[PDB]
Amino acid sequence: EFLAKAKEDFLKKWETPSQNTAQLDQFDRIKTLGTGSFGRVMLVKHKESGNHYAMKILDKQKVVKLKQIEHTLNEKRILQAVNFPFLVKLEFSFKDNSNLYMVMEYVAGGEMFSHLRRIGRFSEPHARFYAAQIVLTFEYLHSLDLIYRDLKPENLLIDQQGYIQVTDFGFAKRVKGRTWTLCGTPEYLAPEIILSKGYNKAVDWWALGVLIYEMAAGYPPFFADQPIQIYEKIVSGKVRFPSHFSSDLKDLLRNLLQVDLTKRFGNLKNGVNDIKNHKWFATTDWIAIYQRKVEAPFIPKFKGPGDTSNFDDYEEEEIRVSINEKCGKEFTEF
């Protein structure tokens, strides 16, 4: 139902993105929630409303130096245009002489990553609860001709109701047809990305296979010390399963972690419904998940607004803003 109206709303925002909807001095910067190659994400408090937000800060010069301009513009153009129960909400965006800023709702429960490593592994119903939300999220994204391209626990945040909010649209792209960029995170890369094959949205379904495996096992299906060692294992595709995996889960994973593109679940004629109707998801009420009516297996501890106890600590750096505008032309549309 939602999808028809949702594509029309998406397309309107896609064609005319919002721009310049706040400025830096409207926020108190509190502390760093995560660091990345082009900047960092900080907890901030909006001075007027008192609300807390997560502000992603990107260094314009570094983005240009590493030739990531298009990905960065993709990221913001797409995130401001989407709307879904399991996607982080972008509230404001702006830029100054030095930086780009994307201010999202603060998701205080922390990364799925943190909880997964602490607990060790998730039981299959727990993993299935999260997996169902990703399945629905990809159904939404793919219907908008979006590919996501960086599914991993580090990019999945747990909210106050214990549901997932997907963050990090760094590699999100609107593409009808195939695309070729080598991007993602090594453990989650589909074989066709590694082989420089050209690829499509099926790489997101492969990544879901890796995610479900990692959630249920406590370690990813292909791991080593060096990415190249991981890549060798991925293209070979000889996955082995923990003995505690159910038969249904192994069957699903064999169909998602399918090296042959044209046999992989998610990418056949029946699309997402091959996954939704798979026996492992037999107990999943897709509508109740979508409506967020299912009680979550896990609810993070929260000590108030602005509580960061579910995040690692990072060393803080001053936000530097040059008195000269950098890379103005490159980021005109941001």
């Binding site: 995560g34 990345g36 190659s37 590493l66 030739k67 990531q68 990905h71 990364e111 990553f113 490593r117 060790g120 960086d150 991993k152 580090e154 990090d168 760094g170 590699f171 960029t181 080598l182 991007c183 993602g184 995170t185 090594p186 453990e187 096992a217 406590g218 370690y219 791991f223 080593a224 010390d225 060096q226 990415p227 923990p242 690692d312």
Partner: peptide, 20 residues
């Protein structure tokens, strides 16, 4: 165990994305 092998490996912490 496979879990013990994973926990002793070099990639159990947050993993950065790759690009270009």
């Amino acid at each position: 165990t496979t879990y013990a092998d994973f926990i002793a490996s070099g990639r159990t912490g947050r993993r950065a994305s790759i690009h270009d």
